[PDB]
PDB file of C-alpha atoms in Angstrom:
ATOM      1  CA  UNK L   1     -15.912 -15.023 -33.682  1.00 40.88           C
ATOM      2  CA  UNK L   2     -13.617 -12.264 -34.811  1.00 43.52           C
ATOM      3  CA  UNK L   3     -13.519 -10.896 -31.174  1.00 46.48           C
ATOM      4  CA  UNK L   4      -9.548 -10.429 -30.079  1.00 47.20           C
ATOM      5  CA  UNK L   5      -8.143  -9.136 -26.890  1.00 49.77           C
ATOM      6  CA  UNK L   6      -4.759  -7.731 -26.024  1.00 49.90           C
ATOM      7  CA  UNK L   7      -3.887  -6.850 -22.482  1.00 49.00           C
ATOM      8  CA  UNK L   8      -0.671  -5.064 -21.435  1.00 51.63           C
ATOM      9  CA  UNK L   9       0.850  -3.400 -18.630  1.00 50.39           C
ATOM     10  CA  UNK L  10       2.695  -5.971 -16.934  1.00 50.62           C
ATOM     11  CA  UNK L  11       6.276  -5.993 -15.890  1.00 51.91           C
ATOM     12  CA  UNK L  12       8.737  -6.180 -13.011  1.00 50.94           C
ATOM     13  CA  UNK L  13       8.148  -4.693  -9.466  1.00 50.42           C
ATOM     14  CA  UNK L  14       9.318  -4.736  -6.000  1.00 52.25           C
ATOM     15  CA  UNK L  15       6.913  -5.567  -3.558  1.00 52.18           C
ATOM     16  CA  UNK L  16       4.389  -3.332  -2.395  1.00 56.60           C
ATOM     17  CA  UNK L  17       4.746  -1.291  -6.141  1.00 55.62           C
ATOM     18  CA  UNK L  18       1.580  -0.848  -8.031  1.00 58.56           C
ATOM     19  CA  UNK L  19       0.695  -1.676 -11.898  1.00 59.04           C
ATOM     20  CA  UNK L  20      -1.917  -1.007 -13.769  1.00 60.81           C
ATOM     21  CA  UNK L  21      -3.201  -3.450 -16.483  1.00 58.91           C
ATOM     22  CA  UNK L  22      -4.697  -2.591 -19.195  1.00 58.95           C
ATOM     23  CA  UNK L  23      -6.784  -4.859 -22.382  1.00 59.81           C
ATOM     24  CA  UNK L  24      -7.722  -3.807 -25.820  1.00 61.75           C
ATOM     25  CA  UNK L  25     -10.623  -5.093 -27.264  1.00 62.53           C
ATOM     26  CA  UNK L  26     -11.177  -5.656 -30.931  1.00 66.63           C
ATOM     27  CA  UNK L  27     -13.816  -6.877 -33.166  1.00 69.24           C
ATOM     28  CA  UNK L  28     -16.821  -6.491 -31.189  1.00 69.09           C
ATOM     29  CA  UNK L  29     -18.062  -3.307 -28.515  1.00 68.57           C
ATOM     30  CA  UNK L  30     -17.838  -4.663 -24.769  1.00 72.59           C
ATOM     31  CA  UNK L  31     -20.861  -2.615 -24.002  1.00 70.83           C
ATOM     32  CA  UNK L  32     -23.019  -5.288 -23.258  1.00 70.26           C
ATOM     33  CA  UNK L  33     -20.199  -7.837 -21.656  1.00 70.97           C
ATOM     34  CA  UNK L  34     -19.114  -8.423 -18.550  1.00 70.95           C
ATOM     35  CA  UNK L  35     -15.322  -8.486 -18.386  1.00 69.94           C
ATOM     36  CA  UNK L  36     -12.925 -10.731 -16.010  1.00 67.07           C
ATOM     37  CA  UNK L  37      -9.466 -10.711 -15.069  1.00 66.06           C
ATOM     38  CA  UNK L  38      -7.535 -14.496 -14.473  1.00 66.10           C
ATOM     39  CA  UNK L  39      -3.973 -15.080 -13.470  1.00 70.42           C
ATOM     40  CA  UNK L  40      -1.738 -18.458 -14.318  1.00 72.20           C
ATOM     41  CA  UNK L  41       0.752 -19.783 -12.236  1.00 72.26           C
ATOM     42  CA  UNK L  42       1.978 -23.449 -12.187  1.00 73.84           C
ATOM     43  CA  UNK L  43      -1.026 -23.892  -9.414  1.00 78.67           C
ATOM     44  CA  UNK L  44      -3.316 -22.391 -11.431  1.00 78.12           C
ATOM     45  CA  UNK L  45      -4.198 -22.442 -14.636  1.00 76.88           C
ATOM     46  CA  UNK L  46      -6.476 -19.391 -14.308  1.00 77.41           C
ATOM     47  CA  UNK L  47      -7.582 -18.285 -11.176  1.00 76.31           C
ATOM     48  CA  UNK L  48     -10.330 -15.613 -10.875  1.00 74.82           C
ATOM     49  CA  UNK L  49      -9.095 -12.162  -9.787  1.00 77.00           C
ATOM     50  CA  UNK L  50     -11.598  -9.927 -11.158  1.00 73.95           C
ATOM     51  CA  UNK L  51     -14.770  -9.253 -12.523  1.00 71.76           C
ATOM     52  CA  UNK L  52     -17.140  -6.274 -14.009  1.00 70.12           C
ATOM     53  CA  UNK L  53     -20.439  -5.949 -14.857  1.00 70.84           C
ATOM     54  CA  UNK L  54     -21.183  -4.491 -18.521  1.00 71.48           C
ATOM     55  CA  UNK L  55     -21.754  -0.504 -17.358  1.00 68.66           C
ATOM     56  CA  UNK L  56     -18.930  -0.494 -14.359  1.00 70.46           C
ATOM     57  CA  UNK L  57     -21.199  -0.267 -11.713  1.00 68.16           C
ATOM     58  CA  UNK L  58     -20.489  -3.564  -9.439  1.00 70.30           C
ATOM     59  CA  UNK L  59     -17.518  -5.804  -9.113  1.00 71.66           C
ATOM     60  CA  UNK L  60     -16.244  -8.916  -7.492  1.00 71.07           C
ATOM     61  CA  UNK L  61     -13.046 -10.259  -6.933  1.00 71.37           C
ATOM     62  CA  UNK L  62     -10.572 -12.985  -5.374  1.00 70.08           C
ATOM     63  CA  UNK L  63     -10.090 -13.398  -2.283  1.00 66.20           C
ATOM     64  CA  UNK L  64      -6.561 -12.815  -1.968  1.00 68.45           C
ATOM     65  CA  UNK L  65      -6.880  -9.761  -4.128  1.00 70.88           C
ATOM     66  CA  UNK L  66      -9.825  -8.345  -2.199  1.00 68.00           C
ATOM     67  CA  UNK L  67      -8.798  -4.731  -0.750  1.00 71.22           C
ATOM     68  CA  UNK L  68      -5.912  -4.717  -3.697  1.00 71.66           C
ATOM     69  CA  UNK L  69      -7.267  -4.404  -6.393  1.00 72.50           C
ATOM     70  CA  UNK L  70      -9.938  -2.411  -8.081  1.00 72.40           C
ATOM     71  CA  UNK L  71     -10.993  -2.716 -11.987  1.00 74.34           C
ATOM     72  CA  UNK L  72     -12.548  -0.800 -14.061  1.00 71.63           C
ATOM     73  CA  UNK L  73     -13.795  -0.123 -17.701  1.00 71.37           C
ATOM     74  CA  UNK L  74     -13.979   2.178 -20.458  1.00 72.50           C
ATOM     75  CA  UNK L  75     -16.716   1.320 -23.145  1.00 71.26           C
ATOM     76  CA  UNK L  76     -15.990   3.746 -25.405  1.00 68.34           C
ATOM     77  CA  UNK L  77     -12.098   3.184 -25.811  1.00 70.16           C
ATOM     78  CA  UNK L  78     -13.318  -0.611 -25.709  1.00 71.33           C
ATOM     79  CA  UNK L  79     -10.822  -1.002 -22.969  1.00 67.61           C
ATOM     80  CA  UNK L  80     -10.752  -3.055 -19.562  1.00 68.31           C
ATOM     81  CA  UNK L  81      -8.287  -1.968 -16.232  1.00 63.91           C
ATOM     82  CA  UNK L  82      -6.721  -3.828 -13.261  1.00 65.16           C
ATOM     83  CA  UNK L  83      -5.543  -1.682 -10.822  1.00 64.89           C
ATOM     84  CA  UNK L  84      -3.033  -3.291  -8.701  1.00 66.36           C
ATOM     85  CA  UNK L  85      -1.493  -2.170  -5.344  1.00 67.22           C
ATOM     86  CA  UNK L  86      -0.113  -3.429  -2.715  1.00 66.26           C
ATOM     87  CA  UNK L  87       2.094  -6.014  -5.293  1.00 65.11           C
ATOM     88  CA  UNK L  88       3.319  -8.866  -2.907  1.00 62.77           C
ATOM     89  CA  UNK L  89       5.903 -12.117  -4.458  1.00 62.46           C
ATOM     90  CA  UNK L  90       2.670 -14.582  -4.688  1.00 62.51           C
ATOM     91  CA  UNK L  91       1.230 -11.989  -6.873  1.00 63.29           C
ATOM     92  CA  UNK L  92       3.482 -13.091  -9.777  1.00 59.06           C
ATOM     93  CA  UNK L  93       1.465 -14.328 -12.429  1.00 58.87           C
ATOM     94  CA  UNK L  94       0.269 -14.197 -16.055  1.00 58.93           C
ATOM     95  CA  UNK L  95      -2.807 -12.169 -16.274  1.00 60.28           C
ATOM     96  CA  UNK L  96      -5.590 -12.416 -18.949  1.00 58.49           C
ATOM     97  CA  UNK L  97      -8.542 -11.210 -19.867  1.00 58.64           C
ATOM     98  CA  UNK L  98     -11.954 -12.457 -20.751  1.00 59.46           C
ATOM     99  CA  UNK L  99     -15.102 -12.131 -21.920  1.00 60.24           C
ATOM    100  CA  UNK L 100     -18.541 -12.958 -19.967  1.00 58.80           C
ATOM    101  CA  UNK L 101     -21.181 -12.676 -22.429  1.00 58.06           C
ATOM    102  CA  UNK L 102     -24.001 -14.713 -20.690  1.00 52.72           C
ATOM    103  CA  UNK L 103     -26.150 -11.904 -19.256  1.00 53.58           C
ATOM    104  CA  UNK L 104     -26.474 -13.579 -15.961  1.00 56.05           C
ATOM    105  CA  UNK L 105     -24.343 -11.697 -14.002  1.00 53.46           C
ATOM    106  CA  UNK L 106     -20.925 -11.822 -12.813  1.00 53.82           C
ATOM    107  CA  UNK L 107     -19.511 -14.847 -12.124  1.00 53.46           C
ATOM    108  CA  UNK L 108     -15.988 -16.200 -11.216  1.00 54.12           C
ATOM    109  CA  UNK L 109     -15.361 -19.773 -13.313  1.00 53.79           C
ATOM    110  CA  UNK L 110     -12.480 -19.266 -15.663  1.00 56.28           C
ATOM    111  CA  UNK L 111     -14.819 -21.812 -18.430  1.00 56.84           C
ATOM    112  CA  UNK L 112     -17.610 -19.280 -18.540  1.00 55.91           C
ATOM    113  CA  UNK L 113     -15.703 -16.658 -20.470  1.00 55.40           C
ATOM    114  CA  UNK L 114     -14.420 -16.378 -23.925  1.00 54.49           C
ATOM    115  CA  UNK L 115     -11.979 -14.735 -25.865  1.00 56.61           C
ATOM    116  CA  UNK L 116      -8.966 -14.879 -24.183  1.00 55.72           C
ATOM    117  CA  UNK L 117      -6.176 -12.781 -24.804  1.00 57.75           C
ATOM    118  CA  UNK L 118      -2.251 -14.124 -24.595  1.00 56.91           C
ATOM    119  CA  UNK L 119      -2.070 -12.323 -21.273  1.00 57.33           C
ATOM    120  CA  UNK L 120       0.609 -10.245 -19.849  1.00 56.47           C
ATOM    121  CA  UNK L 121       3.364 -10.820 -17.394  1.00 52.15           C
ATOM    122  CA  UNK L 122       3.654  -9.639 -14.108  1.00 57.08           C
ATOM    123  CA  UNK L 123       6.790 -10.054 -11.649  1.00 56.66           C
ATOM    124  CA  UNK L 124       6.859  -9.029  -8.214  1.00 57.84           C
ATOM    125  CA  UNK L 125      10.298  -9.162  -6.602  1.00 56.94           C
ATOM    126  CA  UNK L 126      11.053 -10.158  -3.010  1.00 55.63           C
TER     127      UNK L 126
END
């Protein structure tokens, strides 16, 4: 598959700053995708933050994200968001993108999506 993804937007914060995260798609429309955020720390190799269903219209998330966070999508531009407030130290984290292309759904198991970006760091200071 020819499908590549490039997110960006990361970078150094103080807590309680915002970012917002952004990924490019390329090689394939998202229209009929669901798309998911992940985040890697030594812990966790990619735990679930986010997820969208293919026209925007319902989400789920983490846990500890819940209330934080909100994504979003853009079809058109091909593009996925993470909207991120609230930025606290445990935040810290190398966030990817992903693609869900099952048609069943969201769903929150890093090994049911594809296409992986190299992710983008994000630094919350103490």
């Amino acid at each position: 598959s020819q499908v590549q993804l490039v997110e960006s937007g990361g970078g150094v914060v103080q807590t309680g700053d915002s970012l917002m995260l952004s990924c490019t798609v390329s090689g394939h429309t998202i229209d009929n995708w669901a798309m998911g955020w992940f985040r890697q720390t030594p812990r966790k190799q990619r735990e679930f933050v986010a997820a969208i269903d293919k026209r925007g219209t319902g989400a789920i998330y983490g846990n500890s994200v819940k209330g934080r966070f909100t994504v979003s999508r853009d079809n058109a531009k091909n593009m996925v968001y993470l909207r991120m407030n609230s930025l606290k130290p445990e935040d810290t984290a190398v966030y990817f993108c992903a693609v869900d292309q099952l048609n069943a759904g969201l769903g929150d198991v890093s090994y049911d999506y594809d296409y992986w970006g190299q992710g983008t760091q994000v630094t919350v200071s103490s």
